[PDB]
Design a protein around this ligand. Structure first.
Ligand SMILES: [Ca+2]
Ligand SMILES: [Ca+2]
Ligand SMILES: [Ca+2]
Ligand SMILES: [Ca+2]
Ligand SMILES: [Ca+2]
Ligand SMILES: [Ca+2]
Lengths: 509, 509
């Protein structure tokens, strides 16, 4: 029982059934290690680099790699992979702006009344990655760009951009040389590549170049009246990185760290073709991960098969407290977040859910080629231990034990919540979602939402818990508050209420 | 029985009679492996690189190569070979366009009434590859380029192109540097080569640079009145890549992946001279493959000999369901697609068909220097399990068992089909093809096709099944529908009806 088919210092049996690294040697997994902090690693016994990255299974598991690599990349099934993009902070034509890395994913999402057959996720038509950045101009107050830039039919150029690089991956990049396009709708103004002074020497995960506390970088554009007025009328300019060139660190025979000749492009296509892509957006910081998966046809592919929940826990270092995952305290269970899939992933999940008795997305096996996006709600209450809503709900009755997880709220009457506009970002699309149950299957619920327009909807709860979602929008920072009223004709059980922010509606100057 | 003449870790006997890779070692083929997913590999025992590519037979069969290489390139008889071309998406002189990679092959194809001696294919005079790209300008509506570009005898230049690279091969290319010519009829405007910013760092098969969801690349042209009016009058500009330079990945002694010094041009001429070329066009995506073949003179050439159907199955990973091949569900049997050959391949197939009792193209041996193109029909019905026609046929009688494969349609009267123009691309040439049989050899069929011009033809079915083809054209998106009527004087058996799109007719502004 010491065979090593792939020659990476881990025996086949340990690599097949579970192992952990102690004193820099692989040992067989024992269930008593879990309380001591030891993690259970499983990988392929026919391949030395299971995930497709520059580091083998033993190097990743034992930590004999760059110490700037995230700890969740020490799992052989999670790839060490940089995700580097560029985003602008100032637009000079003299007005600031913000950037969003998950707007393109969300724009092509349509929200309906309810969900069928236990599939509580959502489908997007324009799935994209965190490197596709869309900037929203702040502090406008209906001041068109033409005021002070008087133009009739001239292409006067005079636009300046202050960019900053970001890394949402698990590995650092060295000698970062990005290539970007600044496009408004479909017009490629230029293909600008960092020549010699906009090269970042190093860029750690969750960090920017230049680091926080430094002025944004400036890289060095003609613009005509047509696209200028397009920008003036409900359009946001976008900055997309087509490619980034950079290096990774490895040890010499002398023990030094080198990055020259260690191009990250030698591995990008291999990693992207042997794994599934997952994105987590907590509302302030975004993470993108690649998790290795099996190809269905090959009988000689020995990559371990794990579920979606196991993949999420391994990739984002979530903590399993009982049966639910927590990311730094934020609940990220399938009933506490918003799950967005492309068409193929949604079809696969729907097909697999027919034969699954649990009817949970997190119990569906993970397959390569998938694309998953998790949106953590801006506000979420479950009536059990977590409530981050700015204003407490009215008529709250927690004296129940029939909740989705622990307890529920007994709706006998009406529940109204008020939200000041200062707690929400202006010109955004939001979704209010929840789970409802009517054991008698006789009662009905009316939902009234006060927004830029008044909305009223009617839903009939079923015997068991079902999910409902309703969308609304916000207009202007200096406007009225948001009122949400849920009224029931009888007794209803409510649980897992949340409000999450979707993409931003157009700004009309 | 352990000889290894070529020293590639596969014994001569296994390599001669059939082998498969299990636990990273070669084992003798057994017929009981087929249901377990194992493929049967055969190669040459006198050469380590049977197909001529950078990877040996053992590396390809065992998968010890780049994980971005397609699985069908793991067969030693199918080469790992990039096919990189360039195609434009926007033409600015302010109007969009589309690209076609198989128009040049199809333009030189003449369609006749019937086929003789069991040869159901077609002959082309201008066979070309997927790197020869012809663009068709969309959304014209008879608006000449001179309107707004008023020119009498001046060469005012002012043309802009937005290009995008594509890969139809089985292997990725690294550091892509294409060289292209933008030519209208025979005028070489310039020989433009990607200098420093239009270099794609990596380009996987079935993918583009920049990837889908990114703005098209712009590379940086004088044009005179003569060729401008030529373009105005029924001419489409073409963009041909003369050569592309790029690299492939290989493993170090340290186990890293390197692409520097690994030029793809060291192998192009060798692969092209030791193989046959096959192209498959499903109507939306196109694939080009090279399959190794034997040279006739050499008695010391040990390359295995396979038929055309075996070559197609190996090259495109088709599935043999019974006796017919399916490509992702699309039937690609010789009676369900359009086969186009150049002159030499057609002559060889005709010569070999004389001694073949089966009289099938797919049973003819494959030889090097061949050139095969497969066009999947836009619409196809076989009355057995597959029918993707937009509108169901009239007077359908499937109560028969005398079909070409399973059942046929009994024509006693007339069959009429209507096709809305929204289901067809305007300004295109189409072919309606089918198989007919008259056991009594007494009846006759009249075919009436309503198109830009009204066409009527008469055919006399033979005792057994024979193929008929009739061509027509479409004009304008906003026009009348297409009517096809087949009328029989008696009882006829019809099977395998299809409509396939040929090249595009000239556009007159
Ligand atoms: Ca091992
Ligand atoms: Ca391994
Ligand atoms: Ca609860
Ligand atoms: Ca051998
Ligand atoms: Ca060999
Ligand atoms: Ca049939």
């Amino acid at each position: 029982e010491d065979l090593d088919t792939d020659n990476d210092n881990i025996p086949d049996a340990y690599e097949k059934n579970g192992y952990t690294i102690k004193d820099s040697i692989a040992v067989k997994w024992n269930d008593s290690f879990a309380e001591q902090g030891y993690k259970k690693y499983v990988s392929s016994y026919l391949e030395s680099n299971t995930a497709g990255d520059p580091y083998t299974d033993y190097q990743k598991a034992s930590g004999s790699i760059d110490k700037a690599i995230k700890l969740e990349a020490r799992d052989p099934l999670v790839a060490a992979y940089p995700v580097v993009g560029v985003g602008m902070e100032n637009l000079i034509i003299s007005r600031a702006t913000t950037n969003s890395k998950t707007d393109a994913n969300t724009v092509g999402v349509s929200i309906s009344a309810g969900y069928q057959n236990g599939f509580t996720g959502n489908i997007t038509t324009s799935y994209s990655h965190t490197t596709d950045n869309s900037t929203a101009v702040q502090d406008s107050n209906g001041e068109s760009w033409n005021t002070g830039l008087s133009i009739n039919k001239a292409e006067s150029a005079y636009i300046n951009a202050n960019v900053r690089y970001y890394n949402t991956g698990t590995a650092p990049m060295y000698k970062v040389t990005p290539t970007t396009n600044l496009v408004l709708d479909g017009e490629t103004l230029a293909t600008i590549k960092a020549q010699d002074n906009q090269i970042g020497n190093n860029l750690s995960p969750n960090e920017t170049y230049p680091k926080k506390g430094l002025s944004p970088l400036a890289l060095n554009i003609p613009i005509n009246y047509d696209q200028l007025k397009k920008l003036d009328s409900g359009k946001q300019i976008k900055l997309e990185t087509t490619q980034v060139s950079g290096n990774y660190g490895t040890k010499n025979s002398q023990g030094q760290i080198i990055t020259e000749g260690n191009s990250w492009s030698n591995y990008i296509s291999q990693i992207d073709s042997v794994s599934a892509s997952i994105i987590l957006d907590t509302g302030s910081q975004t993470f993108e991960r690649r998790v290795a998966a099996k190809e269905q046809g090959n009988p000689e592919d020995k990559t371990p098969e794990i579920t979606i929940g196991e993949a999420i826990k391994k990739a984002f270092s979530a903590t399993k407290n009982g049966e639910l995952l927590y990311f730094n305290g934020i609940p990220i269970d399938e009933s506490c977040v918003e799950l967005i899939f492309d068409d193929n992933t949604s079809e696969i999940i729907k097909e697999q859910l027919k034969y699954l008795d649990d009817k949970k997305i997190y119990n569906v096996k993970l397959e390569r080629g998938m694309n998953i996006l998790i949106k953590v709600p801006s506000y979420f209450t479950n009536f059990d231990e977590y409530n981050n809503f700015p204003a407490s709900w009215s008529n709250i009755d927690t004296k129940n034990q029939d909740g989705l997880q622990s307890v529920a709220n007994k709706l006998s009457g009406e529940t109204k919540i008020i939200i000041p506009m200062s707690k929400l970002k202006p010109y955004k699309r939001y979704v209010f979602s929840g789970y409802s149950k009517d054991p008698s299957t006789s009662n009905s619920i009316t939902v009234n939402i006060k927004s830029k327009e008044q909305k009223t909807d009617y839903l009939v709860p079923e015997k068991d818990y079902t999910k409902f979602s309703y969308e609304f929008e916000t207009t202007g920072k200096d406007s009225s508050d948001i009122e949400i009223t849920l009224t029931s004709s009888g007794v209803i059980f409510l649980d897992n209420l949340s409000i999450t922010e979707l993409n931003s509606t157009p700004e009309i100057l």
